[PDB]
Write a protein that binds this ligand. Structure first.
Ligand SMILES: OC[C@H]1O[C@@H](SC[C@@H](O)Cn2cc(-c3cccc(F)c3)nn2)[C@H](O)[C@@H](n2cc(-c3cccc(F)c3)nn2)[C@H]1O
Length: 138
C-alpha cells in the first residue's frame, strides 16, 4: 500500500535484462496513469494511459528533453480497466523498452535517450492504488 506519486530509484541506471514490475489497482473513474523513467530533469520514457481523451482510451508514449515534449507514439490497444488490478512489466532491451500488461505484450518504445545508465529514477503517478514496485535481472 504505497504512496502515489511514488519514486523508485534505479541504482546505476537501467541496463538490458532489467525487469521492472508494477502491481496496482486502477481507481474507479480513473482518468490517467503515468510511468516516467527519468534522466535528471529529462523524461527518457513517459508511458501515459489516458482513459478519456475525446471519449477514447489511448496510451501515449513520449520523451521530454530540456522541458520540451517530442513526437508522441500512440497505442490504441488499451488493457487497463477502471476498478481492476493490473500488472505492468517493463523489460529493458538493448534497443527499446518492452512493455507487457497482465502478461500480454503491449508495445515497444525505441530508446531516444541513449545514456541508459543515467536513467536512474522511475516516477509512478496517476489514478491508481499502488501495491508493489520492484525490479530484478532476468
Ligand atoms: O506527449 C506527452 C505529454 O502530453 C501532454 S498533452 C499534449 C499532447 O497529448 C497533444 N498532442 C497530441 C498529438 C498527436 C500525435 C499523433 C496522433 C494524434 F492523434 C495526436 N501530439 N501532441 C500531457 O500534458 C503531458 N503530461 C502528462 C502528465 C501527467 C502527470 C501526472 C499524472 C499523469 F497521469 C500524467 N504530465 N505531463 C504528457 O502526457
Amino acid at each position: 500500500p504505497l504512496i502515489v506519486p511514488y519514486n523508485l530509484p534505479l541504482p546505476g541506471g537501467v541496463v538490458p535484462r532489467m525487469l521492472i514490475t508494477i502491481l496496482g489497482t486502477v481507481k474507479p473513474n480513473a482518468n490517467r496513469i503515468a510511468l516516467d523513467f527519468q534522466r535528471g530533469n529529462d523524461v527518457a520514457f513517459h508511458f501515459n494511459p489516458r482513459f478519456n481523451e475525446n471519449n477514447r482510451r489511448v496510451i501515449v508514449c513520449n520523451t521530454k528533453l530540456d522541458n520540451n515534449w517530442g513526437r508522441e507514439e500512440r497505442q490504441s490497444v488499451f488493457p487497463f480497466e477502471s476498478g481492476k488490478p493490473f500488472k505492468i512489466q517493463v523489460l529493458v532491451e538493448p534497443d527499446h523498452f518492452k512493455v507487457a500488461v497482465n502478461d500480454a505484450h503491449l508495445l515497444q518504445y525505441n530508446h531516444r535517450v541513449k545514456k541508459l545508465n543515467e536513467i536512474s529514477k522511475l516516477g509512478i503517478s496517476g489514478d491508481i492504488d499502488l501495491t508493489s514496485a520492484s525490479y530484478t535481472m532476468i
